[model samples]
Target: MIINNLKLIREKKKISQSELAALLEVSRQTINGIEKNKYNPSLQLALKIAYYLNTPLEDIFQWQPE
Candidate 1:
């Protein structure tokens, strides 16, 4: 399974779903899905999010052995 570390970053930055959605030009549902590990974003969107968060792409996303 692949997972996203959005929840961790959001907690660290103290940002809400709506805020992240606005930053990413997406809907709050998108952010929430990402946060809940319920959706996998396109590589472009993932890279954009990581860039804005000033983190490595690997830090935000990774392949998990499941």
Candidate 2:
């Protein structure tokens, strides 16, 4: 499973979901799903998210073996 700090960092950066979705070219629902941990983004999308957030990927996502 993956535990992410997406919402925390996004909020800290004052970036709205709609703005991020627009920059990432994904729907707000996709950002919403990701923030809620109900969806897992593809690797490329994940990279894009981290890039947009100006943080390292590891800062956003950490994986734990179940």
Candidate 3:
């Protein structure tokens, strides 16, 4: 399973989901799914998010056994 570190990163950035989604060109629901670990983003999307958040990729995602 892929767990998300979105909440932590968002808090670090002091931004809400809506703001993050807008910056990443995704919907709030999509951001929600990503944050909740219900969905995994494509490489492109992931890179986009990392860039937008000014965070490292590993800071946003990590691997674990399902």
Candidate 4:
């Protein structure tokens, strides 16, 4: 499984899902989905999020045995 620390980091940085969605050019639901693990982001979007959040990709996402 791919588990991400998106919510944790985003909250730590004090960014709202709505704000992040606009900046990333995606919908608020998309950000919500990513946070809920209901959707996996494309590589381009993932990179943009990490870059924008100033977080390393590894810190944002990690693998675990399913």
Candidate 5:
């Protein structure tokens, strides 16, 4: 199951995946991968995401045992 709140939070902020990717200096697929939980971002990249989104890292990402 998807564990991160990236997509929902991004949508709530009125940003598209592609747009966010652009802002994050990554490919859209990278953002999609994070949203889909198909990839885990590097810590620096994750921090950048949180910074751009103006959200705490933990608020965006969390461990979900399943």
Candidate 6:
């Protein structure tokens, strides 16, 4: 199951996927994949997302051990 609030937070920040992608220096499709939970970001990328959204990692993502 997906455990990220990325899309919500990004929307709250008023940024489109392409805008966030530009900030992260990645492709718009990458951001789309992330928001759709079709891709999991690396730790570094995850950290950058949290930083960009001005939220703690926990506020943006959660993990499930199952």
> lDDT: which is higher, 2 or 6?
2
What's model 6's lDDT at 47?
69
Residue 51 error, candidate 6, Å: 1.6
**Given candidate 2, what's the lDDT at residue 41?**
46
Q: How accurate is candidate 5 locally (lDDT)?
A: 0.61
lDDT of 1 by residue, 1-66 (tens): 346655567668766556656665657555557545655544565565556666676865667665
- Lowest lDDT 10-mer window, candidate 4? 34-43
Question: Candidate 3, which ten residues in sequence have the lowest lDDT sum?
Answer: 34-43
lDDT of 4: 0.62
lDDT of every predicted structure (CA atoms): 0.60, 0.62, 0.61, 0.62, 0.61, 0.61
Task: Give the per-residue lDDT of model 5 (tens digit) for 1-66.
Answer: 256656567679876666646665557545556544555544555566667777676864677566
Which portions of model 5 show Cα errors greater than 4 Å? 24-26, 29-44
What lDDT score goes with residue 2 in model 4?
54
Query: TM-score of each candidate?
Result: 0.52, 0.58, 0.51, 0.58, 0.55, 0.55
Between candidates 1 and 5, the one scoring higher on TM-score is 5
Off by over 4 Å in 4: 29-37, 40-44
Name the lDDT value of residue 6 in candidate 2: 58
Instruction: Estimate, for each residue in 1-66, the C-alpha lDDT of model 2 and write its tens digit.
Output: 446645566779886666667765657546566545655544565566667778786754677455
Candidate 6 wrong stretches, greater than 4 Å: 28-31, 40-42
Query: Alpha carbon lDDT of residue 25, candidate 4?
Result: 58
Clash totals for all candidate models? 0, 0, 0, 0, 0, 0
The order of the candidates by lDDT, greatest first, is 2, 4, 5, 6, 3, 1
Best by lDDT: 2
lDDT of 4 by residue, 8-56 (tens): 6677988666655666555754656655465554445557666677878
Q: Kindly give the stretch of ten consecutive residues in candidate 6 with the minimal lDDT sum.
A: 34-43
* Cα lDDT for residue 40, candidate 5: 53
Candidate 2: where are CA atoms >4 Å away? Answer: 25-31, 40-42
